[PDB]
From a paper:
Alcohol dehydrogenases (ADHs), also known as ketoreductases (KREDs), are of great industrial interest primarily due to their ability to perform an asymmetric reduction of aldehydes and ketones. Switching the cofactor preference of NADP-dependent enzymes to NAD is of particular interest due to the lower cost and higher stability of NAD, and the higher efficiency of cell-free NAD recycling systems, for which low-cost co-substrates are available. We crystallized CBADHS and TBADHS1 in order to elucidate the structural basis for the observed reversal of cofactor preference. In both cases, the size of the cofactor-binding pocket is reduced due to the substitution of residues 198 and 199 by others with bulkier side chains, which sterically prevents the binding of the 2′ phosphate of NADP.
We performed full combinatorial saturation mutagenesis of all four target residues of [name] (G198, S199, R200, and Y218) replacing each codon with NNN to yield a library (CBADHLib) of 16.8 million unique genetic variants encoding 160,000 unique protein variants. Growth was observed in three of the variant pools so these were each subcultured under the same conditions once, then plasmid DNA was extracted and sequenced, revealing the presence of the same [name] variant in each case (CBADHS) with G198D, S199Y, and Y218P substitutions. Unlike the parent enzyme CBADHWT, purified CBADHS was unable to oxidize isopropanol using oxidized NADP (NADP+) as the cofactor, but could do so with NAD+ (Km = 17.49 mM, kcat = 333 min−1 and kcat/Km = 316.67 M−1 s−1). The resulting maps showed clear density for NAD+ in the case of CBADHS, but only partial occupancy for TBADHS1. Interestingly, NAD-dependent mouse class II alcohol dehydrogenase (ADH2), which is distantly related to [name], contains D227 and P247 which are equivalent positions to 198 and 218 in [name]. CBADHS was not among the 567 variants proposed by CSR-SALAD. However, only NAD-dependent CBADHS could support acetone-dependent anaerobic growth of ALPS cells, which lack either intact transhydrogenase gene.
Numbering used by the authors:
A (entry chain A), D (entry chain B): 1 to 352
B (entry chain D): 1 to 354
C (entry chain C): 1 to 355
């Protein structure tokens, strides 16, 4: 089979590979629609997770089951499925402690395009189908369902980690796709004021749609001063770090109130340092909690978010600004995430 | 001053009373708009909180400050305020443990028409004005703002106590005003499926507006079987008890999954004991947590809910089906809560103004 | 093989049964030491969980692995293991939500002598060996190690559900073996005052050892009034329900403060009603949270409690008052739990495999 | 009255001062025993909290009430009291949100020797006596009781923020007085393995007393390698940062497991920034939560910790290595915290 792969660091290309075979508890899936993620750009062109050889990329897909192992009981060939980007090994001690994302190692619940061939191929492999797949509703648009696999679960996890209260003020730094879902998720945890911080105009209309009450552009002043001006010097209750470089941590600490929470869902791949400013952190005693986590996956998470979409708790269509048709456009779409034209949020490639 | 009072158990009426005077840290407030609560029907006609003599009723009001004590620093006469129904004494050991609602005693954070003259008078008294009042925005409709003081904070507390997750399935038993904010709150905590249980048609359209995805009527079959049929025998993640008798706890325990949470905000005014169905509670070992709490009050809560309204997170106007103009209609409005016509959710009395 | 079984309701006896075989992920264990639980007396003589026929009893054992399935990777024949009484199925949606105890159904994590042949036999079956077993330290006395599997994990779960704070006052109702570990667990969560409620003298000394600061006897006065007298009318922050009848729930609600937490680990097997007293529950608005749960099992829990014993955080030997030697004494030991002589807390039967 | 004060940065001295007068809700207290804190050395000689002029130092005291305001109801002159180092303003919006320590500002619940004349004087002022004092039990040694006001509440808060579970493995970095109470607190939250990190033998012996199962000395190797060797490369569940430089945060992140919690109770007085190591933090996605908080105060905290001492849950006497008798020795004791002989844990000055 053909697949679009990281040959090595700074090298992309189509490769031929043997089709994966399903173990007793696994499924082989054919993609129906996929989306590129900025995490693959960090991975390929920055070596943020180390070096790889012939690793098929991509981890956002909805697909059709083509083969199942003899012990798979809830899915069969022909079933259409939402595939969460995180597919844990459920029999691990980390699962017993409540951390499916790190089953058998740090980030090891995220396999696709981390250390396992991803979804940019004619077929891909899902471990433990009954625990890690969910049925795609018959009338749900493919582009919407692909947004569940990563953008929605990651952005909402930012809001869950932030422990938002009814009426909390929230700053979301970085209003790309993940930050837009952080804004939506904060609204769905009861946030009052939500300030988005970014410089891209396409995201402003989407950010307001999902629930932003204020938009700040760093280009017209240092952002902490801008936030202090908006909040009369009081700061905000919660900060979600969804995009930008490592210096946003220092910004988040400086704008959150004592007792507040900072929630990172941004993947920090770069040579910039994550620095906590000492004085604004109350010399370590200001109860400014800092969290950061890989998104949950598995069947339960996927089915619960699927129900949110089905009952219209969030309209995911606003994330998808570009739609391509055909394997041939996977390369162009991924390179789009590297260059980022001003009007791109997420791109979806539809396979026929 | 004039006030509408509980004369005793089973007796309502207008009374004349001396005006309250503010202590050094208190405010005297004038109502601008008020609403009757079903809890006052429990208090007066069931003696659910004991006996009272000439207690002015009501605890849902927005008003104008007319007088403040010498140590009040953030409010002055003329300020228009949202008055939370719960107004705690903030200097207590219960406050140090995080339970403002019970500062200096069980439920003692709720004073108005519990053991303190309430808001159905020409003036009423608010303890610790700086800690217990919030400014009413100039452009907020009065009838919407009165819904903050009790319905919203109670309904949202129900959803807060339920510890809802992104996509949790939720049943709300009782879709009166409080349950409607339970539905709204559950949606604003990320609930997926929301099943409302009630028999009153007026609440059906409001429930759908606030986020209900299914509506069950108990009159056409035992409600647990109905929920089991909707959920393929699996039950739901969370139950909020917002209305009905003591038997709703048994229904909630029976329809919630093992590991789930039951969140009671219903004020149970009759019966000696609430019954836990033993087998459906896993004989005590099914991890079906049971909670129940008085709504939070105080300035911080009121300002945070106010911000939710100001930023259009919830539209409170759908709660208000009846609006009167004039102080004197407090009597008719409260009596409406006793008789409950088919089309009532909440009534607001707006006092005459220019 | 021989196994000590519930022949029917009200009938105990030895039966011959096929020796279990392990599936690919399972282990077969030979018991080295076992303990009878009061719940098995309830099952046989009260039919509290329904009717069973020829179910081998017992769910407290440490043992030796004799056979493992072809996919077992961390345990091998010859390993000595602690077997938690709760051995969940780990591949379920309830596990993904964090409730191992109810994987694939309410209380379905408790298999032994619930709906699965238990440990009172020559061999028994453990599902998912890699997820549900823990290595027994070579120098840990067997009778101590058996107390981990049920008594320690249940009592400590009572203290965990109670969400104790540094200095909380705690009442533990029923200071049998489980309540004794409830006392120990409460101390190990930072409790200040710990009031034990019981009438059995043997438990009083153990209760003081494990951390009780006061002991109240229900027989000489209404306990709620007694607790109010001890606390100058203020009540307590937390209640752990570990023994007694269904009426202890109402008593717990009446003695806990507003905002407090009641934690049930007592299995209410009788048809007596569980009642929340309305006025003392603030008519539903007093923030008196009621929790209740089956004890966690699995490898991680067993290893974490094992480390606590190894590092001397709790001395389990005070639970064991009776030690037998020989498979034959299982009947006598189990019947001891039915009658409960004045000097019994827990009994352990030590097995001596031979030809 | 006389008091030992921070004249400015790098200037200590005795000053003459007016005796404070109690407002309607306050108490004036005469100290019976006091203790110097390392935090005062940060404040004076590092200017960690800004500049001060003639601020009386000290915030660990037990005393006798000599005067109360007209509205004080539970305390009267002659009462002997434990005075928590944190004495919040209880009527603030931060109290309504559950953060007494930051009432009316970051760290502002801690007044003594922060921005209020402290306890190293003949008298000092306690705001809101009914809310901020606790009765000293008749039979409690004074030197033990002084350890409640700061060392016990701070160390235990470290264990509380750490969210310890029954059997959690815990590393405590820095085994001075606060770290010793972190060890004691971790044990009283049910920790199994407790690893103490320090190089001072007296603190090692005390750490074993309070519950440490292993002791690591930084002098025989990088402590992360040592912890990884002790845990066969698995790491620990929880880390409490109780002493050391800013780099201890990086060390904590490297030794804690994915999903673990790092709890800072160390007052960081120097440096611009604390660095979070990127890869060891899972590039932001390892669910390694970082907390850090000023100790709780107020009457309820002091009474609950007092009950723990009365019921022998913790023996505080092992904290006290140096005892002076006489007001005159306040200067010598505080300078001891600056020099720190190898066998010092805490010093107490007993006043007559
Ligand atoms: N597979 C996974 O586990 C996973 C999934 C989703 C996201 N992530 C990570 O989360 C992050 C979010 O993804 P995305 O698609 O939103 O990224 P993105 O490329 O859209 O960047 C986010 C936004 O932040 C803005 N930004 C850049 N610098 C900024 C600054 N200094 N201040 C404020 N805003 C700034 C950019 O304009 C951009 O719109 C990514 O870095 C990604 O690697 C990982
Ligand atoms: N102390 C306070 O401040 C406070 C605040 C809010 C609410 N409360 C209490 O909360 C409760 C809710 O108040 P409300 O204004 O919604 O009352 P309500 O009169 O609207 O009653 C709620 C609804 O529940 C329905 N119901 C009755 N029996 C039922 C059953 N067996 N199953 C299902 N549904 C049933 C009724 O049809 C009604 O429409 C009240 O009992 C009130 O006392 C107290
Ligand atoms: N299935 C399981 O895994 C499991 C595990 C542990 C415990 N449990 C359940 O937990 C309970 C604890 O068992 P145990 O071994 O401690 O039983 P036990 O026989 O030791 O009984 C506990 C104590 O409660 C006392 N008591 C009786 N009535 C009382 C009252 N009114 N007030 C206060 N105390 C009273 C009894 O005298 C006894 O002292 C059992 O009922 C059991 O069913 C179940
Ligand atoms: N708000 C308050 O008043 C308050 C309360 C409690 C604690 N604190 C702060 O908490 C800290 C506690 O100080 P203490 O007196 O308990 O301890 P301490 O002053 O003895 O210092 C901790 C010890 O750890 C050791 N150490 C140094 N570097 C290390 C490293 N890299 N790894 C391991 N160990 C190392 C040193 O021997 C040092 O003495 C202080 O810095 C203090 O400022 C402040
Ligand atoms: Mg970015
Ligand atoms: Mg479109
Ligand atoms: Zn991604
Ligand atoms: Zn009301
Ligand atoms: Zn048992
Ligand atoms: Zn200090």
């Amino acid at each position: 089979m053909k697949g679009f792969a990281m040959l090595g660091i700074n090298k992309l290309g189509w490769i031929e590979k043997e089709r994966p075979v399903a173990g007793s508890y696994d499924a082989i899936v054919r993609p129906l629609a996929v989306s590129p993620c900025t995490s693959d750009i960090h991975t390929v062109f920055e070596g943020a997770l180390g070096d790889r050889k012939n690793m098929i990329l991509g981890h956002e897909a909805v697909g059709e089951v083509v083969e199942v192992g003899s012990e798979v009981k809830d899915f069969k060939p022909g079933d259409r499925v939402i595939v969460p980007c995180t597919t844990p090994d459920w029999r691990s001690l980390e699962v017993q402690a409540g951390f499916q994302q790190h089953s058998n190692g740090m980030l090891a619940g995220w396999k696709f395009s981390n250390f396992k061939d991803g979804v940019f191929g004619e077929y891909f492999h899902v471990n433990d189908a009954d625990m890690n797949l969910a049925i795609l509703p018959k009338d749900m648009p493919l582009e919407n369902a692909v947004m569940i696999t990563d953008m929605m679960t990651t952005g909402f996890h930012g809001a869950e980690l932030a422990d938002i209260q009814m009426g909390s003020s929230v700053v979301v730094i970085g209003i790309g796709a993940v930050g837009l879902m952080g804004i939506a998720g904060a609204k769905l945890r009861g946030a009052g004021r939500i300030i988005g911080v970014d410089y891209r105009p396409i995201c402003v209309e989407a950010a307001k749609f999902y629930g932003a009450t204020d938009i700040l552009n760093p280009k017209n002043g240092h952002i902490v001063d801008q936030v202090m001006k908006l909040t009369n010097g009081k700061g905000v209750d919660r900060v979600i770090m969804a995009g930008g470089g490592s210096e946003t941590l220092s910004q988040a600490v400086s704008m959150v109130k004592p007792g507040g929470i900072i929630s990172n869902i941004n993947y920090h791949g770069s040579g910039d340092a994550l620095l906590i400013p000492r004085v604004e952190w109350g010399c370590g005693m200001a109860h400014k909690t800092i969290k950061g986590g890989l998104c949950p996956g598995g069947r339960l998470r996927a089915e619960m978010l699927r129900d949110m979409v089905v009952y219209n708790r969030v309209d995911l269509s606003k994330l998808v600004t570009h739609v391509y048709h055909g394997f041939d456009h996977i390369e162009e779409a991924l390179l789009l995430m590297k260059d980022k034209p001003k009007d791109l949020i997420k791109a979806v490639v539809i396979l026929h």
